[PDB]
Design an enzyme around this catalytic site. Structure first.
Site, PDB file in Angstrom:
ATOM      1  N   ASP A   1       0.883  -1.189   0.000  1.00 44.71           N
ATOM      2  CA  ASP A   1       0.000   0.000   0.000  1.00 44.71           C
ATOM      3  C   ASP A   1       0.923   1.243   0.000  1.00 44.71           C
ATOM      4  O   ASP A   1       1.748   1.434   0.913  1.00 44.71           O
ATOM      5  CB  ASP A   1      -0.912  -0.013   1.229  1.00 44.71           C
TER       6      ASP A   1
ATOM      7  N   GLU B   1      -3.842   4.186  -2.485  1.00 46.23           N
ATOM      8  CA  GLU B   1      -4.188   3.831  -1.123  1.00 46.23           C
ATOM      9  C   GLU B   1      -5.674   3.970  -0.896  1.00 46.23           C
ATOM     10  O   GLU B   1      -6.286   3.091  -0.295  1.00 46.23           O
ATOM     11  CB  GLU B   1      -3.433   4.678  -0.105  1.00 46.23           C
ATOM     12  N   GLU B   2      -6.272   5.055  -1.387  1.00 47.33           N
ATOM     13  CA  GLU B   2      -7.676   5.290  -1.062  1.00 47.33           C
ATOM     14  C   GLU B   2      -8.544   4.261  -1.733  1.00 47.33           C
ATOM     15  O   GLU B   2      -9.473   3.761  -1.126  1.00 47.33           O
ATOM     16  CB  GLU B   2      -8.113   6.712  -1.359  1.00 47.33           C
TER      17      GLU B   2
END
Ligand SMILES: Nc1ncnc2c1ncn2[C@@H]1O[C@H](COP(=O)(O)OP(=O)(O)OC[C@H]2O[C@H](O)[C@H](O)[C@@H]2O)[C@@H](O)[C@H]1O
Length: 507
Positions: free
Chosen positions: A281, A299-300
């Site tokens: 990540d 990441e989101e």
């Protein structure tokens, strides 16, 4: 030509290459919030302890259901009782939900905007979908949120700076906590000028409801797919969250380990094509980035499709340079198309991952934050290179696990998007860190076929010449010294890979 290097079939994967798990048990460095003696495949875990035990202090989550969660009413009232009264009203219009959330957040009634929530309900959803939202999904979310004290009976310790500690909890426990986050019930997590939790990410979901970004409906559809699934049928597995801090980092210039193997490809993604591998990540130091606000990159997106990741934000303090977070067992609930401003929710996903002996999905994800570079040359400074190496090494290293039980690292263009890094340098940095941790690398270039060819060619050049980790790091130091240190221009005369080829071939 779509992939280069070691065939992917030759790389190590979980569950097949792991050591047999020890018995799950609580200890000083491992918090376990379920009854390990009663853990059974296909069965909802029983919380341990049986009845709620509260801690309200500086080492634990401040639970919304704590009797010390008060509000000035000129006297003290129970905020948990206020939340119960507020949320147990029927909703038929989005204003209802806003007014409910604000009843126990009165200090934010003029600061929190709900435009995105109102627009989603009124202006994106069809009538039938809106009706399903307020008649079924939201009231079910309220009930699992309000079951908190019966579901999360054990205090949750904060994963604070410099702690080497693990928390293992059930997916059900996470769903109850996340429903609370959705309704913005976590106390002391809201003031812009807060002390205690200023070093922790946002957890309450209020910023998901603000503004008119066209990506808000796609975030909300992605999150509601999850909530629909986990409130309709209770998930049965467990998830482990581990904070890891390393004390001794390698003397990189001195490292005599050889490079390991590389598979590099311009097709596929970390999350779909890295099954059984350590999945990277590309984090912010405040883990999850802008998942609950405006962010929508690597990441989101991962935090949205595997929402159990989001609860890391409840207890994970901002990562220092020597730290990472390793999350084992998160389940994929959605599929998506596009990225950033073209990101769309596509459909519900049925996770077919196998579970390990602790009823955790065999999906291991590590959050490591790259540095954010504002000027290109900055990243070649030795301190900064050594920082990135040590970060990746911390993320990859499993103290006291042997190399034949370590899966390949599934990674890619870490730090080279929102954070401005150079992919070619970062690729080599990851390759060195993987070497030192004795893991192979599976590298996804996300559509860049030239970068694939370039990483491949450099890696095989260095491997065929038997250059050690140390030999390679020394070449990076030379590049800095010859082409970057005394350079007053934003970009050097000669690129890194050409420099390396010429330096090695010249000796
Ligand atoms: N699924 C994927 N698989 C493989 N590679 C990917 C994928 N998605 C993107 N890429 C590639 O990976 C590149 C980098 O992805 P980025 O998300 O910008 O990571 P950063 O480390 O630079 O920025 C981290 C910050 O952004 C967030 O807000 C965090 O919270 C931090 O605040 C992309 O340009 C693609 O080439």
């Amino acid at each position: 030509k779509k992939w280069l290097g070691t065939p992917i079939e030759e790389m190590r994967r979980m569950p097949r290459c792991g050591i047999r798990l020890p018995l799950l048990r609580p200890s000083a460095n491992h918090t376990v919030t379920i009854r390990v003696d009663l853990l059974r495949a296909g069965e909802v875990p029983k919380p341990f302890p049986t009845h709620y035990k509260d801690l309200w202090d500086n080492k634990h989550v401040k639970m919304p259901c704590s009797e010390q969660n008060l509000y000035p009413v000129r006297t003290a009232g129970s905020r948990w009782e206020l939340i119960q009264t507020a949320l147990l009203n029927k909703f038929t219009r989005p204003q209802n939900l806003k007014d409910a959330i604000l009843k126990y957040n009165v200090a934010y009634s003029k600061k929190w905007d709900f435009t995105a929530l109102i627009d989603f309900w009124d202006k994106v959803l069809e009538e039938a979908e809106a009706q399903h939202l307020y008649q079924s999904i939201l009231p079910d979310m309220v009930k699992i949120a309000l079951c908190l004290p019966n579901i999360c009976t054990q205090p949750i310790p904060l994963l604070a700076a410099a702690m080497n500690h693990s928390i293992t909890m059930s997916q059900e426990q996470i769903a109850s906590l996340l429903a609370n986050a959705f309704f913005c019930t976590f106390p002391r997590r809201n003031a812009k000028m807060k002390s205690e939790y200023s070093s922790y990410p946002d957890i309450n979901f209020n910023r998901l409801f603000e503004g008119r970004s066209s990506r808000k409906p796609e975030k909300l559809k992605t999150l509601f797919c999850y909530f629909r699934r986990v409130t309709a049928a209770a998930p049965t597995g467990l998830v482990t969250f581990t904070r890891q801090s390393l004390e001794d980092f390698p003397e990189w210039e001195r490292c005599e380990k050889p490079l390991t193997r590389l598979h590099v490809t311009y097709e596929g993604t970390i999350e779909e094509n890295g099954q059984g591998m350590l999945q990277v990540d590309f984090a912010n130091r405040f883990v999850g980035g802008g998942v609950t606000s405006a962010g929508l990159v690597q990441e989101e997106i991962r935090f949205l499709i595997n929402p159990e990741l989001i609860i890391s934000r409840l207890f994970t303090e901002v990562l220092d340079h020597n730290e990472c977070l390793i999350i084992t067992g998160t389940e994929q609930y959605s599929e998506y198309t596009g990225y950033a401003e073209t990101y769309r929710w596509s459909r519900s996903h049925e996770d077919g991952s196998e579970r390990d002996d602790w009823q955790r999905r065999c999906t291991e994800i590590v959050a490591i934050d790259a540095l954010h570079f504002r000027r290109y040359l900055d990243q070649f400074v030795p301190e900064k290179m050594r920082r990135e190496l040590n970060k990746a090494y911390c993320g990859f290293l499993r103290p006291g696990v042997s190399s034949e039980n370590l899966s390949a690292v599934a990674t890619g263009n870490w730090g080279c998007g929102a954070f401005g890094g150079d992919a070619r340098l970062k690729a080599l940095i990851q390759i060195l860190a993987a070497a030192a941790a004795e893991r192979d690398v599976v590298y996804f270039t996300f559509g860049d076929s030239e970068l694939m060819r370039d990483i491949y060619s450099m890696h095989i050049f260095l491997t065929e010449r038997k250059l050690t980790v140390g030999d390679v790091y020394k070449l990076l130091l030379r590049y800095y010294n010859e082409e970057c240190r005394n350079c007053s221009t934003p970009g050097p005369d000669i690129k890194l890979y050409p420099f390396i080829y010429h330096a090695v071939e010249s000796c």
